[PDB]
Structure 1
C-alpha cells in the first residue's frame, strides 16, 4: 500500500503558545484508535482548521495506490491514480528525527517521529508499534482529510 501510519485525530488545542505565524497554525491533537499525540503545522490560510475538529491523518511513503517509489520531483502532468485524490490537505516532507524512551539496555516502548514539510513541522509520538514505518531522512506525505 505504501502507508506508514493511519489514524483519526481530534484537534484538542490550536497555538497553545500563541499565534507565532499568520498563515501557519500549530495543532495539538490526539487520536482515539491508537492514543498518539500529534503536533502539526498547517497552512490555515488555505486549509483552515478549527478547535475540536476531527480529521483522518495518513502518513504515507508514496501517493500512488500501487506500491511504487517516488522521485521527489514535481510532476503535475501525472495521470496515475494518486491517493491524494481522497484527501483535502496534503503535504510532503521528510523525517528528520526519531526519539524514544529507550534505555541503554531496553528498547523503546514509545517513539516520537519528527517530520518537516518544507519547514512546517510535525511530531507524531506514541507507541513504538505504530511508528515502525518511520526512518530518519525518509520522504513521506501527510494526506489529511477533515470529517464530520
Structure 2
C-alpha cells in the first residue's frame, strides 16, 4: 500500500527559529536513495530540530487492501494532498492544502506516481 518509504535526515531550516509563529520549511536529504526534500511543517505542534531522523511514507489510501478515498496508529503526522506538477532527476510538487512539498530524487525511484491524484503523507520521528 506504501509507494515510497525511506529514512530522511533534516539538514537546515528556512526560518531557523523556535518561536516565529510561522510555518517552517525544512530541507531533508534521504539516506541511501539520496533524495532532496522540501516540506512545510508547523514546529509549534510538531517540533523538529536539526540532525533529527524521521521516516516518511506515501500511500494512496489509509485503508488496508483497497478502499481508496488503518495506518493512523503507526504514524503521527498524517497529511492529505494532491500532485499537480510532475515535470522536473524527476521531482514532485504536492500541496497539502497550500503546504507545498518538493521531493527531488532519481527518475527510477519515482515512477509509479500519476498526475492529479490524491496521496497521503505518513511521517514519524522514530
| TM-score, length-scaled by structure 1 | 0.77
After TM superposition, list the pairs within 5 Å mapping 1:24-103 onto structure 2: 24-70=23-69, 82-100=70-88
Unaligned runs of 5+ in 1: 71-81, 101-109
Where does the alignment leave 5 or more consecutive residues of structure 2 unmatched? Answer: none
The CA RMSD measured in Å over matched residues stands at 1.6
Correspondence for 1:146: 125
User: Map of 1:89-128 to 2, 5 A cutoff?
Assistant: 89-100=77-88, 110-128=89-107
Q: Which has the higher helix share?
A: 1
Larger Rg, first or second structure (1 or 2): 1
Select the residue among 101, 104, 108 that pairs with 1:129.
108
CA shift, 1:64, in A, is 1.0
Task: Please state how far the C-alpha of 1:138 moved relative to its aligned partner.
Answer: 0.8
Paired with 1:84 and 1:99, the residues of 2 have a C-alpha distance of: 31
| Secondary structure in structure 1 of the residue aligned to 2:109 | helix
